[PDB]
Amino acid sequence: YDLINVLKHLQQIFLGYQSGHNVLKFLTKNMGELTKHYRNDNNANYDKLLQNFELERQSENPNNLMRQLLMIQFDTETLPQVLSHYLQIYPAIYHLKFDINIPYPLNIIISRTCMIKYQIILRYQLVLQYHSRLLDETWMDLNKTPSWKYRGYSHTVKRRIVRATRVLHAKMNHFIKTIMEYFNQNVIDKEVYSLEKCYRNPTLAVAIQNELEGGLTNIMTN
């Protein structure tokens, strides 16, 4: 079964490990669809997004079964809502998620608890990447539109309105990007490296799954 390729695929899918390009493309293609589905209600039709997702999955290589069996779904609760459900914390956006139906005999190792952890981490990374994409789009609109760069009429505005919001966007970028790099290097990168180095000459598959769930817990218990 070549478990290494399967774990690499699932890290690419749910952890974005060396797969930021695909998720970034999917976000850029459907920014408007996501915002129109998060501002509307559950009765709003999201079949266009599902068609785009299945088209992207069809354009995916058939060998990547983890991506070929990837299925999308809409939730009734937000991410902080399910976080309050599973963890004792206090919180209509981010109702999307992705799931995999692990078959036999792969389902005996890839249980449903790890799948739920993957869904949670994936929705979290999706939130983070969508916010970074919004910041990038804001910077693009600021640095490309001529009206924003244009100045005149005894401005008093550029230095006060434009410069201020530019500095504020810089602050937001220095916060979001900093925390993203921190979490992806001191948490994501280290856990990925441990997951890579553990399967070297394994002893017990149950031990492998226990190490995987312990890494997921360390990610959660951060």
Binding site: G16, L135, W139, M140, K149, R160, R163, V167, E181, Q185
Partner: protein, 441 residues
């Protein structure tokens, strides 16, 4: 997302040859454009799409269009890369060899044959959908090169206002032709203030010195400096050509590096590298990146005022030395009190399909800085221009077209270029003051 490279002048042709060779060696494409990777495994983590077009033959044609007034250099680049580039992506203006090192002749050549270049770039853009911007490779010193660059910059700003346009420009060394070369520069620099969304600066004197330092033979060939520029361009594009999680767009890099469109001139640095042992740790790599003898431009400053700095470390690195060097650099680099002391590091993955560079396992680093050293070279160039202009009226003898019909408009254009670069350097030196952002505080 796709980016197109623009090679202007013989300098542009040389650096494009070197960069495309480097990228074909990295992405395993070779000089024939065919995939040097086996067809049994299709899993890849790089992105050849924005720089290479893959056909049914699975051949990667470089997404670059060469524009020059000298067909010999382009023909030679084609000869050394037979079967690599597309003959339709070649533009020589069909005017024969180059003639005249003034910006007037180059800009007139650009204006006359603008339709062909527009058709070429439109065909290249229509080949795909997700396009992001262009890459311009030219020397401000070259007259025809600077004229073509300014013409294409005007065309792309009044034609594609949504596509961010960045350029690479190398300022000449302390030599004799500057008395006219600087002319072209400031003219190009004029457009660089108006339409250029981003610009990476280079100084030929510092480049030659650093090459003579790293190379054993002090007789530095221009092709060696072209190799250095190809290495720095491949390094800054490593996050784009090899994105994993964080950086997947040049827009993000210019976000974290360019705070405002008025300040879009960045100084590069890259160390250590060859062009075979490891003796520079990531901490050492970064402290050398700070060192002036590792920057690709003449610093000529005791303590430059850094505004926004961002670096990419290539190699397998532990975050401990990262944090130590970050703390030391914050203790070393000064930031204005009105701006942020932002320092960002990108871990650039190594290509497994690239032949191993000399000094293996030697971690390296590139850094892009926005400081008052770029304006120092700008002031040198503008002072040379002012001297050679207010002291001698000889530029009224080498002009073409609208510039040759009357030299008073040429004098007015040069004075306006001087005025706009003066306003630019004044904005820069004011940004060094905390009172720059006083309008809000």
């Amino acid at each position: 997302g796709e980016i197109i490279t623009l090679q202007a002048g013989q300098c542009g042709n040389h650096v494009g040859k070197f960069l495309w060779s480097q990228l074909a060696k990295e992405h395993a494409i070779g000089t024939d454009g065919l995939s040097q990777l086996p067809d049994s495994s299709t899993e890849r983590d790089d992105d050849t799409k924005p720089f290479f077009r893959e056909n049914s033959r699975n051949k990667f044609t470089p997404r670059a269009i060469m524009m020059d007034s000298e067909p010999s250099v382009i023909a030679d680049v084609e000869n050394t890369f037979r079967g690599f580039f597309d003959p339709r992506n070649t533009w020589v203006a069909s005017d024969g060899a180059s003639a005249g090192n003034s910006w007037a002749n180059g800009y007139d050549i650009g204006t006359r044959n603008q339709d062909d270049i527009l058709n070429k770039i439109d065909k290249e853009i229509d080949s795909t959908d997700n396009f992001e911007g262009f890459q311009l490779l030219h020397s401000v010193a070259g007259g025809t090169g600077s004229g073509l660059g300014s013409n294409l910059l005007e065309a792309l700003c009044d034609r594609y206002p949504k596509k961010i346009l960045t350029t690479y420009s190398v300022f000449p060394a302390r030599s004799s032709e500057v008395v006219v070369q600087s002319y072209n520069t400031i003219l190009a620099l004029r457009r660089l203030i108006e339409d250029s969304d981003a610009t990476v600066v280079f100084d030929n004197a510092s480049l030659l010195n650093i090459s003579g330092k790293v190379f054993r033979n002090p007789n530095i060939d221009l092709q060696h400096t072209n190799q250095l520029i190809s290495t720095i361009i491949s390094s800054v594009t490593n996050s784009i050509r090899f994105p994993s999680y964080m950086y997947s767009s040049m827009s993000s890099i210019y976000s974290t590096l360019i705070p405002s469109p008025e300040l879009h001139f960045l100084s590069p640095s890259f160390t250590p590298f060859t062009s075979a042992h490891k003796g520079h740790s990531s901490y050492d790599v970064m402290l050398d990146l700070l060192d002036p003898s590792n920057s690709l431009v003449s610093t000529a400053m005791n303590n430059p005022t850094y505004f926004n700095v961002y670096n990419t470390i290539i190699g397998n690195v532990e975050p401990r030395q990262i944090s130590r060097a970050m703390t030391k650099l914050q203790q070393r680099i000064k930031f204005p009190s009105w701006s942020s002391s932002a320092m960002h590091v990108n871990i650039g993955r190594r290509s497994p399909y690239l032949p191993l560079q000399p000094n293996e396992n030697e971690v390296s680093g590139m850094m892009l800085s926005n400081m008052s050293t770029v304006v120092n070279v700008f002031e040198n160039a503008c002072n040379t221009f002012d001297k050679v202009f207010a002291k001698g009226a000889f530029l009224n003898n080498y002009n073409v077209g609208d510039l040759f019909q009357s030299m008073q408009n040429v004098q007015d254009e040069f004075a306006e270029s001087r005025e706009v670069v003066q306003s630019l350097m004044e904005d820069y030196v004011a940004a060094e003051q905390d009172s720059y952002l006083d309008d809000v505080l």
